[PDB]
């Protein structure tokens, strides 16, 4: 390697950070506390231990645990040695987990004790795995004992910046999970170029060197939104809660004085509604709600607690971060409502992102704020293709751009607002109607629990929508009333107001995926 | 080019910024005002005009003017088309300028009217130049007329990120100026990784999206410290003063409400001592004094005016930025003095910088804060070699590291303090003594104007120091008194206190280079 | 290397010559005499000494001395080891010498004692030079002492025949000197193909194995016209005079019985006009006057002394030899005058030379002897380009041919006669007039010392000529008389006879370059 030819490697994020305080703390909730010097020593020890296990540059190490110092150490030691880090979604079914393990061809598996029963249904069909390391919170952890036998000195290799570092096997609508992968260069550029955008904000929604970081995301989904890398590059204090219990989360936020975190709307709603939060000071917190479609009512309610709530956008193929809501100081004088609308949007695109809006022919629809279309992006941290896929990869990068699958409109000043998914469009007549606004209208009904809208195919009118609704306790509302209730509203195009073929139906239950999202694909098969 | 293979190009800094306000202003002092949309249109127009002139990817365009919107437009249009941008140091002698022009083989020269007489001494010996464009501040500017005939639509090329973009021909101690060069990738990484460090500071010395930028640097030295790129990436307001007159500078700072600037100690001293600054509010200003060795007394005096003064470090081979003074909130409670010492240091190394201290055998001396040595660095934005040089290039990158030429010590917490130059070391006996502290001691004398210390070679004691001093008005102090005056001080090692062979001498004048720096090399030849 | 694949190397010129007499003498004037066996031993010793100094294949060794056995030994030992030989023009200014040394990046410098003061003005700004060897004519020479410590046995390497051997940095009209370079193959082909032409002449102007060679050229200009190589290949006696004093030159010619030499018109005129030459037998001498434009009067005067005077042509980019005057036995019966005209011409092209005449559009003007045009040549010993130059190199080889810069006409039988330079053409009207014939007409005036003609630009008539003349002692001739004196002559085209805008002016002095040639470029700037 030419010393004058600089390679962008993950080890430079750790050993050449923005700031490095040797006495800054890393805290695993009520279990462990150490310093950044101890963290570096443990990273070197884990590198030595992995080298002893026969792990080489091309190997793959799979991880299965919660959010802890161990996961943070795996985020660095495994990529630095050159091997690939496979984050297993522990929320998938055991069959899908087995498929992902077989597809990735893992060599070492680091699994928490609480996930052992799942492995009990899968270990029999697992090949290519030579060692299982059981992680525990007590003294009998195999990871800690393996660390104890190794020295704290290690000379980390130099390799090409285009070597793969992480894979985590997203699961969309394909029938099988799809492998996504990133290199050292992409991760370094991601953290650098998002720190250069979020950190340069004037007064709102900025992460700086004086914060205290705390993930409330699974940390195996999308690299925990890349935020652990940014937090360790800033040399900030990091707190890891573990199993995401609302009471212990609130206690940790109070005691550790957490000021920056990121979350999904469900856990945020559970922490705001907790009785322990009624007498808790929240005017130092900077939650980023970028999971999926931060509701306006939840954002308002959180703003009344003096919480800096803003939304971000990701995909799991795109870094993941593509856009973040940033408010100008003029926009910070709005009272509670216009701020609620602005903060719940998709946000403006981050540095080094193109983010055009196109249609089915890739025609780059204008940014008038009313014309909806698919989002299509270019960024320095996108997956070139799906692992071991050809035609899905070709469909992913159709037309020289990465296809997102989200239908949105971009307004004049640049604010993005996602309206629907590509596959969930009611392509009624020749128009493209979104099923989200119909669901929201029907959800507002007093005697309605959950609403799902499905496109029923027609001879004419293209395909028409069919509504599936679940009622509340001791509630019995006829189908005609629900049809009429939607007809009450106004401001809809096409035939009258798209209220002639709503076809609302009662189901007792609505099918959901293993994560808890409405499985519209299975709803089709059941009803048509 | 593979669309999934992202190239780091300068056009992405302009068209994919952190923030973009179309109505944000670019102001050339009392001459011109336009918006960012107009700036983009003018960049496209200049691209068209350069294309009409026959400028191709491998061509070189040389620029000679002050700080204006024209220089900012040249910072973008010329690199985007692929050609190289040659910044000519207008402070050099005409012979050195001719040498640099001949060495770079410029094709188009953009020269201000006020620099025409210099070209009158050099145009006769100039080859390879096919067009001269005369820049004026009035309506008769050739640049403006060339812009007026072109359209505001242009499709910018994609090329490799390793294509050269800028050259500016630094002049150290070589006998001839040395060519330095950078690529698109290096500049993009420089701006991104310095925004990610300076912008993430908690409360002190940060540049954010609400500032107002104003260069007080020649803008041809080192890319104006790379700050125009950072300012345009943030979509901030930029003000360009022109000829650097203290009165107009103060007027511009007052009227335009400038909050961020960078400067050298001389211009800062002239703006603090100006009578117009006595009744001027300076408590919004964030000068970065990284030119050369910000004095402690000047920093104190500036701190009493409530100015956020801090120092940075550069070389002209290194991006240039390598280290910046950053203060923790604990350090911000010091009154006026300890803050003066901290703010005048070289500073801590920025993100993605190694910055070891070594000796003549490259042994990596420890960071105890007392052991001095040469600074040696690795960074993503260093020059691989000197242009059209082999052995100077080999000496630049000796031992797999870039050699700086500065002798400094690094303390425990990471603060760098530069003590001297490599070639200005009194290698007395076997020790390495710095000539800066001897100059400071002799400069403190009441009847002393300027002191230069030169190493006179000895048979034994290695080489001994010889002092050249200029006296003040109506001052006549004997050599013996000056020798005794230095002997008064204490805390010096080696023989007694290195006061037995000071060899102070009176000169009437001391030779200086074309910039205004003491030319120690010529002092040798004159005296030995 | 394949032994059946023969490489044309300089070592074959020495070790496989046409003739080799071990007892043949090499004489340095009144200082040293040795034999060819001693010369070979000294070449091997110098190879050993250079190897001890760390000189490798890619290194460069620079030489600065007069004509001696040392220069002849450097002509062989340095190229044979593989390194490049840099001949420094000691007649240049110290600044130009410094520029050439820095550009060539010399490692070892061999400098005569008498050239030490020049180095005293330049050594301070010299880099890349690790050793200085001082050459002396006494016993204390460092070169001789270095030779004395080495053995006379050495095995010379085999390398590609396209490896560079010599560079000498010609200085035309560029603003900076231009680097020219040749390979082993080119030098071997040059000596072979010029020996095959000049040696095969019937009775006049031939160099054979019975001659005695003596250079009267600086020996650093153009390889001394390549004649030392030819002389050592023939195994002939060689005499080196040193400092070119006319008295010692005549004494050496008389005592050593020199029969072949080459010279420039100035030294020839000084040796013919010397009082010691009045009683000296010159009917064995074969001077080649190929420096610049052998005058007809000087050639006549030399022919009355029974000297075989003939002219040759070179450039310093072309081997240098391109054409030599050769007389058929029919032409040898002319009395004194027609022989004077024939011998002073440029001559017929030598073997393996194309030598067409072209115009500004490269149209290959006919060889009618009246139509003038630029000389354009192809030969096996031309420089492919200028060292470290791109656009000057492109202009040198424009149109697939090497551009000479001389304007000449070629007659039917093949005789070339150079009329002017390309840049010195009065492009009056649409015609191309030569300034040499106007200078000759004005020089003939009794009260005229030196005449220079410069083209003054006009609105119409293209550009008109302006004459600068210096008068003799106690001579005062009005401008009108000089204008009328030129009008007396006849046989000139265009308007009347190109006598309406002569614009003769008196200067006291006329600027000359460092060599002693009229600097027309500076004359422009002074007068227009
Ligand atoms: C400056 C230092 C501090 C930096 C702060 C970092 C901000 C991070 C903000 C959030 C990034 C979003 C991360 C989510 C990644 C995707 C979640 C994942 O597990 O992926 P999956 O493929 O299952 O789902 C992707 C899918 O979700 C939808 N979606 C995601 N975010 C959305 C928002 N904000 N709004 C609407 N929809 C959103 C999309 O359908 C996407 O394709
Ligand atoms: C058979 C064994 C014996 C061989 C005899 C060898 C015959 C050698 C005859 C002479 C060759 C000419 C050598 C001169 C090389 C050029 C001199 C030099 O130092 O180059 P520079 O670039 O300064 O000048 C080149 C320039 O000079 C003019 N010029 C040269 N020769 C000329 C003649 N004969 N007539 C007119 N002009 C001449 C040209 O302008 C040329 O470009
Ligand atoms: C975040 C956003 C914002 C950003 C900001 C930025 C900052 C910047 C700072 C500063 C940097 C620096 C620059 C400078 C460069 C250089 C100059 C030039 O021109 O160069 P040259 O001439 O080559 O020089 C170099 C030298 O100098 C010196 N220095 C510098 N600096 C310094 C010094 N010293 C001491 N201190 C300091 N600071 C050295 O010697 C070098 O080498
Ligand atoms: Mg996804
Ligand atoms: Mg420098
Ligand atoms: Mg020449």
TrEMBL record, chains A, B, C:
InterPro entries: AMP-bd_C (IPR025110), AMP-bd_C_sf (IPR045851), AMP-dep_synth/lig_dom (IPR000873), ANL_N_sf (IPR042099), ATP-dep_AMP-bd_enzyme (IPR050237). AMP 2 binds at residues 170, 293, 312, 316, 406, 427, 432. Mg(2+) 1 binds at residues 315-317. Keywords: ATP-binding, Ligase, Metal-binding, Nucleotide-binding. Residues 437-517 form the AMP-binding enzyme C-terminal domain. Mg(2+) 2 binds at residue 317. CDD domains: ttLC_FACS_AlkK_like. It comes from the Bacteria. GO terms for molecular function: ligase activity, forming carbon-sulfur bonds. NCBIfam families: PRK06187.1. PANTHER family: LONG-CHAIN-FATTY-ACID--COA LIGASE (PTHR43767), MEDIUM-CHAIN-FATTY-ACID--COA LIGASE (PTHR43767:SF11). This is Acyl-acyl carrier protein synthetase.
